[PDB]
Amino acid sequence: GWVKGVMIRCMLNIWGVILYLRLPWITAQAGIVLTWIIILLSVTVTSITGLSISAISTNGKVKSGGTYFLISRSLGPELGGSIGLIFAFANAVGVAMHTVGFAETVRDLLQEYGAPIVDPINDIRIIGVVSVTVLLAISLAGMEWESKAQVLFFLVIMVSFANYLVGTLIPPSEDKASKGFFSYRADIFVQNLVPDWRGPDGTFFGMFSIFFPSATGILAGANISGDLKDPAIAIPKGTLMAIFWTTISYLAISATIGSCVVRDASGVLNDTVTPGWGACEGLACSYGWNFTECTQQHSCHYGLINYYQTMSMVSGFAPLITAGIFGATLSSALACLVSAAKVFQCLCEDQLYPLIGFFGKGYGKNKEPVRGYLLAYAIAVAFIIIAELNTIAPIISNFFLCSYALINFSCFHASITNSPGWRPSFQYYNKWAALFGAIISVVIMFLLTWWAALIAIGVVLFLLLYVIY
Amino acid sequence: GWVKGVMIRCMLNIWGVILYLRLPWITAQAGIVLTWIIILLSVTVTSITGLSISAISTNGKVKSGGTYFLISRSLGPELGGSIGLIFAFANAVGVAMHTVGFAETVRDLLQEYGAPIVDPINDIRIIGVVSVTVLLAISLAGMEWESKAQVLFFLVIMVSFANYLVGTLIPPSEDKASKGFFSYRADIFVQNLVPDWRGPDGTFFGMFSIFFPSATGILAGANISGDLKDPAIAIPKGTLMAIFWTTISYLAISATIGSCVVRDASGVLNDTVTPGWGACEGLACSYGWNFTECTQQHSCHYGLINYYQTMSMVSGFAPLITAGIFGATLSSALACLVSAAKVFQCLCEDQLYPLIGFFGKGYGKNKEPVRGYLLAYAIAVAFIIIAELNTIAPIISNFFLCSYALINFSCFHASITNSPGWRPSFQYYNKWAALFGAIISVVIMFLLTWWAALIAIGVVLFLLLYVIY
Ligand SMILES: CCCCCCCC/C=C/CCCCCCCC(=O)O[C@@H](COC(=O)CCCCCCCCCCCCCCC)COP(=O)([O-])OCC[N+](C)(C)C
Ligand SMILES: CCCCCCCC/C=C/CCCCCCCC(=O)O[C@@H](COC(=O)CCCCCCCCCCCCCCC)COP(=O)([O-])OCC[N+](C)(C)C
Ligand SMILES: CCCCCCCC/C=C\CCCCCCCC(=O)O[C@@H](COC(=O)CCCCCCCCCCCCCCC)COP(=O)([O-])OCC[N+](C)(C)C
Ligand SMILES: CCCCCCCC/C=C\CCCCCCCC(=O)O[C@@H](COC(=O)CCCCCCCCCCCCCCC)COP(=O)([O-])OCC[N+](C)(C)C
Ligand SMILES: CCCCCCCC/C=C\CCCCCCCC(=O)O[C@@H](COC(=O)CCCCCCCCCCCCCCC)COP(=O)([O-])OCC[N+](C)(C)C
Ligand SMILES: CCCCCCCC/C=C\CCCCCCCC(=O)O[C@@H](COC(=O)CCCCCCCCCCCCCCC)COP(=O)([O-])OCC[N+](C)(C)C
Ligand SMILES: CCCCCCCC/C=C\CCCCCCCC(=O)O[C@@H](COC(=O)CCCCCCCCCCCCCCC)COP(=O)([O-])OCC[N+](C)(C)C
Ligand SMILES: CC(C)CCC[C@@H](C)[C@H]1CC[C@H]2[C@@H]3CC=C4C[C@@H](OC(=O)CCC(=O)O)CC[C@]4(C)[C@H]3CC[C@]12C
Ligand SMILES: CC(C)CCC[C@@H](C)[C@H]1CC[C@H]2[C@@H]3CC=C4C[C@@H](OC(=O)CCC(=O)O)CC[C@]4(C)[C@H]3CC[C@]12C
Ligand SMILES: CCCCCCCCCCCCCCCCCCOC[C@@H](O)COP(=O)(O)OCC[N+](C)(C)C
Ligand SMILES: CCCCCCCCCCCCCCCCCCOC[C@@H](O)COP(=O)(O)OCC[N+](C)(C)C
Ligand SMILES: CCCCCCCCCCCCCCCCCCOC[C@@H](O)COP(=O)(O)OCC[N+](C)(C)C
Ligand SMILES: CCCCCCCCCCCCCCCCCCOC[C@@H](O)COP(=O)(O)OCC[N+](C)(C)C
Ligand SMILES: *[C@@H]1O[C@H](CO)[C@@H](O[C@@H]2O[C@H](CO)[C@@H](O)[C@H](O)[C@H]2NC(C)=O)[C@H](O)[C@H]1NC(C)=O
Ligand SMILES: *[C@@H]1O[C@H](CO)[C@@H](O[C@@H]2O[C@H](CO)[C@@H](O)[C@H](O)[C@H]2NC(C)=O)[C@H](O)[C@H]1NC(C)=O
Ligand SMILES: [Cl-]
Ligand SMILES: [Cl-]
Ligand SMILES: [Cl-]
Ligand SMILES: [Cl-]
Ligand code: NA
Ligand code: NA
Ligand code: NA
Ligand code: NA
């Protein structure tokens, strides 16, 4: 069908690490208004790309084809090959991002039980490489039950959302109030409406580059093609509904975490305001909490802007949100891993590039891209060695923005030149909308960082001109 | 011929304002080694572009001449039309830069002799507007004295160079020693071999963006291909010889000004060393001068890094170098203005763009582009309103780097796709050298500043795709 076929597995790929780990932090540094602006600006790009993908899907009656097959048969081989290569690399790095998020969650779990391995960052590296190896092992042999693991992942994420909302509704406990979360309060909402840039990554585009991986994952709907009853109707509805619902979830979580947790807090339970005259400051002082020492000293360990795991603390039952993080990360990383490998294998089936034709060999009876799986695993491990979401996320934002700009401009190019095999039937496709989407995607790509955007653009130009020549 | 027709024409357009006003200051902030590296890196781009230009001039046989005509007939309507518009805009801004340099020289002359008009920056604006109006009046009516003007300008620049080199060897007087000039000394050479990096523009690429317009002007030989004797053998040798000799002049001036003047000095003549047990701190102490007061407070008025007219101070007779600055700036500004107007008119006569076609008609009997002259004058005035050379220069570096990258990549594209017309006979043209030149030009363009490079590439892509579609 369309619901479970497209929208449920597009949500599972869109929801990932930044939903649970960095969205509260983005809402802390930027304002609620600025976080909403970031979310809507990412969703504009992803929705224009979704319209382009819907136009691609409703083009002809292409059967049994992945993302690369659809794009390269509806559009030209010159643009299709570059789109496939950039998309495969972006998914390979997204594997590293989601594995790093899962490893960070496991490392925090280990720390809370007081059993760390070596040290914060190296523990993340070890857990991430072990996780990604287990992910590769599952992807190679044992993916038959991923059709039933999808329901478990979706139900786990739903339970995590419900638990977070229920815990947010609960009035504060002493420990939670000490950690910064009191409750829905107008004063905290007004305080968090305005930006507060507090680090090296504190900037509007610095937070856009970290958030934007939250919006990617719409092309996961494209590679379903061939397992759908009616792609021309299933693909657009599923993709656009998933984009809309994940956008609603991001906005709701941002506006609800910005209205109940203060930016600065100290995990010390003694900071409860002592009776007397006092010189206590801060918004929390009105709720009996004197977090004055850490706020001025800039040595706070908790709060929205300091604690990277505030959704877990706020929720009524912390392990449920940890399970939700595990489900979201292991769904998104697996989807990216088995998307990059399949796109790369299909691309290597087409003798379009000189050196990448070795990775196009299948293994077993399902012709699975074992060589592509190993290359994606190697790239994922290499980017995992970084072991920092705030550094890996800007790379993935750059490469997914490049892929989306490429898709939008390729659709525009096919429309404006009146390509022989480009007669999309999607009602809401406009070539000028696609051009606007590609232009804004490139502008944002250069705005996040200029050198990586230039590298991606140069790679795209090299591939496109090589196929042209 | 090739000497006066081509090489001297390219000489007078390459030699400009940065040679007299900012090269000693670039040598002060970046040191002699990095200034030479900047000069050689700019000359690499300009010589690789000159090889492509020489290949264009030897391709087929064109009798009418003109930069845009040659490039478009040898390379195609799309690439040729993009080049003929970016180059025209770059030449229009070059008029603003050279007029601003002339206005700055006149403002300094007014300050030293007489009284200023309104304000040191507003005086630059007023003098620049008046001088560019006079240049426009000369261009519209009175363009028959050009051979005499070329001879006078070349002779005055030769006299300025000779007088500077003669006064540099002269042992320093009390005033010159106070201002920081101590003839030739190894200690000053060693001290100035290393960077200083003061001010907001202290940067390797910040200095490259200001120096680079000193290397542009290599397209003056191709402008008169029709009016030559044998372009296929005159344009290449003339362009390459002009590039080589101007490179030699820049390297020599940088090396001798680095080894003569200290970075920090005070115009006060009382700053001679007192005969006692003092606390003298600078290198000039060994030469008998005490510049500690301003050097420690960063309030020195003179020196290599503080005085923009130290080249005139060092020389034997300042008025000769003032005349040399006037000649160089006026020759370069006139060449840029007439080249922009003539390229724009020829581009507009070929109906490749919708609205520019209005600036395509000539006036009088020789069909001068009066509308093109007025548009170039308007752009020049708009950029003159910015009365800072260090602000206009990075813009011209960006646009001339874009033009040179476009020419190089257009030649490479015509070579690789085996274009029909494209059959260059130049012995030293290689398509891979052109590709390297285009790539490094784009990389440098983005390294100077990323947003202006992005705007230039966006305009280039817009024009190219408009002609393609
Ligand atoms: C893309 C962005 C930069 C990054 C580039 C990354 C790649 C760089 C490396 C490139 C060299 C690639 C290998 C060449 C050697 C192997 C042969 C081969 O590949 O086939 C062909 C090359 O293949 C191509 O077409 C490459 C095209 C690169 C385009 C780069 C454009 C940069 C524009 C920047 C400015 C844009 C405009 C700016 C305007 C302001 C060559 O075939 P051949 O050998 O000629 O055939 C026989 C002839 N011969 C043997 C006698 C010679
Ligand atoms: C690697 C990942 C990223 C890849 C993509 C990277 C970005 C690539 C972006 C490329 C953008 C290229 C835009 C120009 C070329 C297409 C439009 C055009 O001008 O041709 C058209 C002329 O149209 C006009 O000239 C009138 C003005 C409207 C169109 C141009 C607006 C955008 C201008 C530039 C703005 C962007 C400047 C910066 C970007 C260059 C020809 O067709 P038409 O006559 O319009 O026909 C109308 C048909 N209709 C009647 C059905 C409507
Ligand atoms: C979904 C669309 C995208 C956007 C959605 C964004 C939606 C949310 C956006 C913003 C919510 C944030 C604004 C309200 C918070 C600040 C104001 C406030 O509430 O203050 C009051 C509490 O309010 C309550 O008791 C309940 C409030 C929230 C109920 C649940 C929120 C929706 C949860 C469902 C998830 C969302 C729905 C999804 C459902 C599918 C308390 O005020 P005070 O300061 O204590 O009073 C002062 C008195 N004193 C001074 C005397 C002490
Ligand atoms: C096959 C083709 C491509 C593959 C090539 C791979 C090349 C591999 C090379 C490098 C790969 C690794 C990059 C460096 C990692 C740097 C990390 C870093 O911190 O950088 C820092 C700087 O860094 C730079 O600014 C330099 C950027 C390098 C140029 C990229 C060349 C490739 C373009 C391809 C061709 C294009 C053609 C275009 C066509 C239209 C960021 O710092 P900043 O912000 O500058 O700091 C200023 C601070 N301030 C302002 C506050 C004072
Ligand atoms: C084709 C050209 C290729 C080259 C281009 C670049 C060429 C120019 C490049 C470099 C030349 C300039 C830099 C080196 C010399 C100054 C630095 C120095 O070392 O000071 C020393 C040398 O000083 C002199 O040599 C003075 C006499 C010649 C000065 C230069 C004349 C013009 C050179 C260009 C003419 C035009 C060239 C082009 C014509 C077309 C003096 O120091 P000292 O204190 O006396 O030493 C005492 C040491 N002790 C105290 C320990 C005992
Ligand atoms: C393909 C060819 C056509 C298209 C080309 C691509 C289009 C764009 C082409 C060129 C634009 C490139 C960027 C320009 C702005 C740079 C920033 C700047 O210098 O601001 C200056 C504004 O100076 C003033 O005081 C007001 C006068 C500004 C006149 C120029 C405005 C642009 C108009 C003509 C351009 C459009 C002409 C369009 C013609 C069709 C002030 O300087 P600052 O940086 O703020 O401060 C620096 C420190 N400082 C204070 C000491 C100085
Ligand atoms: C057809 C038309 C196309 C052209 C449209 C014209 C648009 C005209 C819009 C603006 C022109 C006028 C001047 C703009 C700003 C000047 C002021 C300034 O100093 O900016 C500041 C930066 O901020 C930016 O980065 C601006 C970036 C957006 C401009 C590029 C968008 C246009 C791209 C085109 C589309 C391409 C798609 C194609 C790619 C393949 C300078 O800051 P910095 O120092 O440099 O940054 C670091 C500063 N720091 C010191 C704090 C660290
Ligand atoms: C980063 C941001 C600034 C991106 C900017 C995108 C623009 C370059 C695009 C977006 C929508 C485009 C427009 C969409 C619709 C049209 C109408 C079109 O005219 C038609 O022939 C059909 C419509 C009509 O009848 O006018 C001409 C192109 C134009 C103006 C397009 C010009 C280019 C626009 C403004
Ligand atoms: C001093 C340095 C730092 C200046 C900048 C480097 C250039 C001098 C280099 C960089 C890339 C080089 C080019 C890269 C590739 C080629 C292809 C090469 O092709 C051939 O050999 C063609 C003849 C044949 O072998 O059949 C000729 C040299 C050339 C143009 C190179 C010439 C020298 C270039 C421009
Ligand atoms: C906050 C910073 C960003 C602010 C943007 C605000 C929020 C945007 C969130 C994204 C929504 C953007 C979606 C894309 C909108 C532009 C895209 C608009 O949709 C394209 C339109 O073409 C669709 O309509 P058609 O082209 O066919 O014409 C209509 C067909 N009917 C109606 C005749 C049947
Ligand atoms: C703030 C915490 C974030 C939580 C806020 C946002 C809520 C998260 C977003 C989740 C929104 C919900 C997504 C789930 C899908 C909603 C959107 C549903 O999509 C359309 C359905 O009608 C299709 O479903 P079915 O054909 O299965 O019919 C269902 C009815 N029967 C068949 C079972 C009887
Ligand atoms: C100080 C560092 C300097 C860096 C600058 C280097 C600058 C560029 C190289 C410089 C000097 C050039 C040396 C001499 C001038 C070129 C001299 C070589 O060119 C002779 C030209 O007339 C024509 O080239 P050809 O003679 O090979 O053939 C012409 C075309 N037809 C007849 C076959 C059709
Ligand atoms: C096949 C193509 C492959 C790539 C080819 C070449 C790649 C090598 C290029 C990298 C060399 C550059 C290394 C970067 C050096 C350190 C890079 C340090 O970054 C500084 C520059 O990005 C910016 O300089 P500015 O911002 O000062 O310029 C003027 C703007 N202001 C003054 C107004 C602020
Ligand atoms: C709340 O706690 C803060 C912690 O800084 C108190 O601030 C300090 O108070 C003591 C005096 O009793 C001294 O350390 C200084 O007066 C303050 N130092 C700093 C670092 O601010 C504050 O007095 C407390 N206010 C109450 C009682 O609510
Ligand atoms: C070189 O100049 C410095 C700076 O003026 C002199 O050092 C100062 O000497 C006078 C008188 O002793 C006082 O202003 C201070 O004691 C010194 N420092 C400053 C910052 O002024 C130094 O004496 C001079 N050396 C000479 C003339 O040989
Ligand atoms: Cl995510
Ligand atoms: Cl995606
Ligand atoms: Cl110059
Ligand atoms: Cl030039
Ligand atoms: Na995602
Ligand atoms: Na997920
Ligand atoms: Na010049
Ligand atoms: Na000149």
Numbering used by the authors:
A (entry chain B), B (entry chain A): 137 to 605
What does the paper say about this structure?
The sodium-chloride cotransporter NCC mediates the coupled import of sodium and chloride across the plasma membrane, playing vital roles in kidney extracellular fluid volume and blood pressure control. NCC, encoded by the SLC12A3 gene, is expressed in the distal convoluted tubule in the kidney, responsible for sodium reabsorption and playing a pivotal role in extracellular fluid volume and blood pressure control. The first branch is Na+-dependent cotransporters, composed of two Na+-K+-Cl− cotransporters, NKCC1 and NKCC2, and one Na+-Cl− cotransporter, NCC, responsible for ion import. Thiazide-sensitive NCC has been treated as the drug target for hypertension by the first-line clinic drugs, thiazide diuretics.
The high resolution of NCC-TMD EM map enabled accurate atomic model building for the TMD and extracellular domain (ECD). The TMD subunit adopts a LeuT-fold conformation, characterized by inverted repeats within TM1 to TM5 and TM6 to TM10 via a pseudo-twofold symmetry axis parallel to the membrane. Of note, TM1 and TM6 are broken at the lipid bilayer’s middle region, forming discontinuous sites suitable for ion binding. On the basis of the structures of NKCC1 and KCCs, the high resolution of NCC-TMD leads us to unambiguously accommodate two Na+ and two Cl− in our structure. One Na+ and one Cl−, assigned as Na1 and Cl1, are located in the substrate pocket formed by the antiparallel broken helices of TM1 and TM6, corresponding to the conserved binding sites of K+ and Cl1 in NKCC1 and KCCs. Cl1 is mainly coordinated by the main-chain amide group of Gly152, Val153, and Ile154 from the discontinuous break of TM1. Sandwiched by both the negative ends of dipole helices of TM1a and TM6a, Na1 is well accommodated by main-chain carbonyl groups from Asn149, Ile150, Pro349, and Thr352. In NCC, Na2 is coordinated by hydroxyl groups of Ser467 and Ser468 from TM8, and main-chain carbonyl groups of Ala464, Trp151, and Leu148. In NCC, Cl2 is consistently coordinated by main-chain amide groups (Gly353, Ile354, and Leu355) from the broken helix of TM6 and the hydroxyl group of Tyr540, a conserved residue from TM10. The extracellular gate is closed mainly through a conserved salt bridge in CCCs, which is formed between Arg158 and Glu240 in NCC.
